[PDB]
Amino acid sequence: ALTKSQTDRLEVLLNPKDEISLNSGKPFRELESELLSRRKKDLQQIYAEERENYLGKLEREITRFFVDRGFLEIKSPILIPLEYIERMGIDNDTELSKQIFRVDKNFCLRPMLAPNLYNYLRKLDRALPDPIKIFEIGPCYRKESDGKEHLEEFTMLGFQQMGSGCTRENLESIITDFLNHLGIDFKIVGTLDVMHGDLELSSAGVGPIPLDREWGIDKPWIGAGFGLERLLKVKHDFKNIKRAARSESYYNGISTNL
């Protein structure tokens, strides 16, 4: 009988496509040696043929989708003014107030993309024709309890359209085309949330809302934010989101501790 520590070890080495039973009557050393061989071959095959990291490759695929659909690609600061969090209505009653990674006295690691995209919408509205469509993909940071669905360092897609065409029907069409393009099953529930069973893939929004006026926004809008590691978790059927993260412990969901 395998110890719980031994099965922990084997579970690190197990990939979802594997058809191996850790409850069979094979000794630990030989189950471990066979999984080690499979995971080394998996890495050798990535190295010989494609060589692309899942997170980078997904970011490039989402980028092509949104650029093709008319959205401008934004790359804005990750280290943001702390004032942005308060100005988002995030006071001490919200959970998010307590999840902020603070840096120095005035800055933080952004936990969200809405403040930076608000600022781009306001500025670009003086120069671009209606509607204004933008999107960004990049790191976001939140303090979290340990959890199979949560990372403290994760990657967010955020997109927003402002001006004409900002209907709920148009917002659902973008989400629906987007996730059918990626091959990810979903349900939209309605403020709107895109779910994969009990896992939240996205929260989406329809403006105007009162908060817009703090950001100098006074036009209707639609938008949403998606976690890239959650999309990878669903797509590759990982049991824990850490398999999809920026990590020294996993490469494309394969253990690097061999």
Ligand X SMILES: N[C@@H](Cc1cn(C=O)c2ccccc12)C(=O)O
Q: Which residues bind ligand ANP (CB under 6 A)?
A: 142, 144, 150-151, 154, 156, 200-203, 225-227, 229-230
For residues 37-56, which are near its own copies according to CB under 8 A? 39-40, 43-44, 46-47, 50-53, 55-56
Specify whether the CB–CB gap between 66 and 73 falls below 8 A. yes
Maximum C-alpha span of the chain: 70
Q: Which stretch binds its own copies (CB under 8 A): 13-21, 171-179, 211-219, 246-254?
A: 246-254
Q: Which among 187, 252, 257 has a CA at the least distance from the CA of 16?
A: 252
- Decide: is 156 part of the binding site for ligand X (CB under 6 A): yes
Rounded to 5 degrees, φ, ψ at 212 are -50, -35
Give the nearer residue to ligand X in terms of CB position, either 84 or 238: 84
Least Å distance, CB 241 to Mg ion, is 13
Q: Helix, strand or coil for residue 255? A: strand
CB neighbours (10 Å) of residue 241?
20
One-letter amino acid at 257 equals N
- For the CA atoms of 81, 82, 85, 87, the dihedral, rounded to the nearest 10 degrees, stands at -80
- Decide: is 246 part of the binding site for its own copies (CB under 8 A): yes
Q: Which residues bind its own copies (CB under 8 A)?
A: 39-40, 43-44, 46-47, 50-53, 55-56, 60, 63, 67, 70-79, 101, 103-104, 109, 116, 119-120, 123-124, 126-129, 139, 141, 152-153, 246-248, 251, 256-258
